[PDB]
Every structure is written in C-alpha cells, then in structure tokens.
Amino acid sequence: GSVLTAIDNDKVAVGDKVTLTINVDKITNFSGYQFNIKYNTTYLQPWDTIADEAYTDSTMPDYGTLLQGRFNATDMSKHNLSQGVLNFGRLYMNLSAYRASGKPESTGAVAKVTFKVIKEIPAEGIKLATFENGSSMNNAVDGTMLFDWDGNMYSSSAYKVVQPGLIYPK
C-alpha cells in the first residue's frame, strides 16, 4: 500500500490557502497513523480553517473520512512550527469494537493540512511538504507510522510513502 497526497490548487498567490489532503491506500485493516511532516516556514504557514487562524503547536489538522468510526478515536498534535515541523496522529483505541464492526478501513483520506502562502513562491516551485523522520517515532517509514486493527505496525516493506508534489506562483 501507500501513503499519498493530493494538492487542491497548484498555483498560488500570497494570501492564498492550499490544502494537502493525505490519503492511505491498500493499508489492510488500517487503525491509525502518526506523521512527521516538514514544510518551508519562509513560504507557508499552517492554517486552521475552522477557527480561521494560524496553527499553534497544539493544533490538530483537519479530519479525512477514515478514522471516523465510533471506536474511541484519539488525536495527538504536538508541532514545532518554529522549525517547520508538524507532528500529529489519530488512532482507534477500541480495536475490539472496530474489529467487531466488520468494516475494515484501507483506503481514503486520513487528514488534511491547509497552509496560507506568506511569501511569493519562486518560479521553479517548492515542495508543498515532505514526510521525514524526526520526532521520537521509532521504526518510522519516511516519517510515517501505520497500524492495523490487531495492533501490528507496518514495515517499510509493506508500504511506501509518496512524497507531496510542488506548488507554483500564480
């Protein structure tokens, strides 16, 4: 399987918002994730679209469609925005209830992160973000940890992380 992303709009002007939607695909019996994501603080400012305010170091990103079942999901968000690092995750704690649902998740959106563009993007573009080890995430795969509903952690041989694409100036 894979972790992979989509960018809503490739071309941005200063003040525009651009959203990275983060998906998993073919992650068998998916029960939770943790991500460490780096972005360039010169150009981008993570933005809370519900509050309409910049993230602080505790702000949880927007949800996707997965991890929304009633199986006692728990969120973690503990960034270092000064260093352009987002670190967050979400998981089902009640795995027994999840297993009993007969509705294993494996593909779909898990989170979205919107950024406000704060400086003109160079003509050659910039990577919107990168998944990269950091944190205290042991055995991470390119800055990601994925779990299944038996509490197994997936290895680098089970999935790949497809790095986000570029954004460009209008």
Q: What is the experimental method?
A: X-ray
Q: Using CA atoms, how far apart are residues 47 and 63, in angstroms rounded to an integer?
A: 14
- One-letter amino acid at 134 equals G
Q: Which amino acid is at 45?
A: Q
Which amino acid appears at position 114 of this protein? T
How many Å separate Cα 61 from the centre of its chain?
8
Q: Give the closest residue to 4 by CA, choosing from 16, 19, 18, 20.
A: 20
**Among residues 30, 12, 1, 10, which one has the least CA distance to residue 111?**
30
Partnered with residue 21 across adjacent β-strands are: 6, 112
Element (H, E) at 95: helix 95-100
Give me the residue label for tokens 């009993």: 100
The resolution in angstroms reads 1.6
Taking the C-alpha atoms of residue 141 and residue 155, their distance in angstroms, rounded to an integer, is 7
| C-beta atoms surrounding 90 within 10 Å | 23
User: For the chain, which domains are there?
Assistant: 1-170 (2.60.40.680)
Cα 52-19-29 angle, rounded to 5 deg: 110
> Which residues are CB-contacts of 12 (< 8 A; sequence separation ≥ 6)?
18, 117, 121, 167, 168, 169, 170
Beta bridge partner(s), residue 7: 20
- Count, in order, helices (H) and strands (E) of the chain: 1, 15
Cα–Cα separations (whole angstroms), residue 57 to 21, 29, 48, 119 = 20, 30, 12, 21
Q: How far apart are CA 114 and CA 54, in angstroms?
A: 10
What's the one-letter identity of residue 8? D
**Burial of 134 from C-beta contacts in 10 A (0-12 / 13-18 / 19+):** middle
Element (H, E) at 100: helix 95-100
Distance CA 141, CA 159 (A): 8
